Structures are given as C-alpha cells and as structure tokens.
Amino acid sequence: GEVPIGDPKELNGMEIAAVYLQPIEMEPRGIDLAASLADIHLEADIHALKNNPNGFPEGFWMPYLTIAYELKNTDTGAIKRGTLMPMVADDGPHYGANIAMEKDKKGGFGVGNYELTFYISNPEKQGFGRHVDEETGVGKWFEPFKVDYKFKYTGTP
C-alpha cells in the first residue's frame, strides 16, 4: 500500500523514486518521529541503474547517501524540512522518515498539492571509499544534487 510521488528520475547512475505509506515503527527508538505523531512514512527508493559508473550492480540499493528533504504545500505555502534515514523494511533497505502532515502542530500540511525535493550527497561524506586502481577502479562520485517531485497528498493512509 504505497502511494507514488511524482515521476521517478534517472541520474548519476541511480533511479530515484519517492513513495509514501502509513506511519511505521522504527528501531532504534527516539530518532524517527513516533508513529502515533505522524501521518505518513516517506521513502526514497534509490537503486543502481545499468552500467553504474561507481561500480554498483544494477538494482542494488545505493547505500551511505546523505539525503535531506523539503516538503512544500503549494496551496497553503507551508514548508518543512528534514532528513531521510537509512533503514530496512520487509521490502528491503530504503531511506525514510515518519512525517506529521495533518498532525503537524503548525498547521498547513493537510490534503492538497505538494512539491517534494530531495537533496542528495555522495557516500564519501560518510567515509565510504572507492577503488581508483586501473584494474578494479571506478569513477568520481556525483556532486550534491537535488531532485524535485509534484504530487497530491490525499490524506493519511
């Protein structure tokens, strides 16, 4: 039961898609917003394309990324920011966050039209290395980038 967000993008060797579903319970506790405080779980699905230039096998999950988001209700003008955290669910690893929409104390994050932006930086920021020898080496990582989606939020699932 995942709601697609906008259209997926292909860039920097990766497919980058967004979905939301109902709030989830994550361990370790005290990091992700508690399920009962949230209205959605937002996920970024990020996997390697064919011929990924940093050596990741097609379809592999892209690990050690730093991902921030911005969510804007274009009807009300309300904007929030946060980060997506790496975690695993029954359908495998992803980057996600529980997010208050209707339940956000500030208001303005209810049913309506939204723009979602991911701000993504490469794994080296988190100490992940790459071979650069002639035999087994791989190319440079992408510079930090953003991807943008548009979607209708129809209410908490």
Next chain:
Amino acid sequence: GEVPIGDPKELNGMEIAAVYLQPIEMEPRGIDLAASLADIHLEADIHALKNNPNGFPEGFWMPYLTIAYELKNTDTGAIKRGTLMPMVADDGPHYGANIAMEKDKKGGFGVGNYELTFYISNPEKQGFGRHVDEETGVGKWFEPFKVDYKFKYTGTPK
C-alpha cells in the same frame, strides 16, 4: 587477482567470504593505508542469503556492518588488528583494508600460516534502522559474532 581465504560461511542470514588482492589505491586519500605502504588488500564479501530474516533481498550487499579483524601468523605469533571499511570497486561494494605484511617491520607478518578472524556487529551499531511494526517490520538483528579462517599467505599477488 583475488586469492580466496578459507571457505565462505553462511551465518545469520548472510554469506561471509574473505579474499585478498594486491594493494589498492583508494579515494578519498588518507581514508586507508597507502597502497605503496601495503602488501595486500584484505576484503570481506558479505551478502544476504535467501530468506534473510532482516528484510534483505537475496544477493544484496549487507551495508553498515562493523567488521573488525584480527590477523595472526601462527608460525611467528605476530598479531595485528584493524577494521575493514566500506567501499566500492568495479564489481560492487565490499569491506576492505590495505595491510602491510612483509613491509611491517613491527612484527613477523611474512609468508606463512595465518588465522584470520572477523568480529561482525549489526547495522544498528552505526544507526541503521529497522521497521518493527506488524505490517512492514522485519526480524531482530544478530548479536555480535566471529568467523574464523585459516590460510597460507604466499606474498603479494602479481
């Protein structure tokens, strides 16, 4: 190319293999022992088995693991320890380190008989999360564990 260390182990929903190669030039610089100062590149290859209890599809690389190693020359008694760091090569991600063997004059790390031990802790130690709700959740992570290999080190591959 790659020299296999011992046999791969299937444990805790993962296949856990060890290999060594020639020393590898890594980026970013300083993230590991310089290739020129090393004799081997030690790698741990760790992927999900079928029916992985923590949600990982078969074949996927297991990320965010903490992998400490101990390498012991059982002939000489020489021991060294370190950690294998996550990185990617043209055939995919793994955990690795450049290691001085003959070049290490602080111990007897020459050609001979070795025991290699990996001490492996689960992704939660590095902040990686898991769903635990009924609908989308996965099983509990393994407690820290060790795997042991024996091999003959014959010098840098060439």
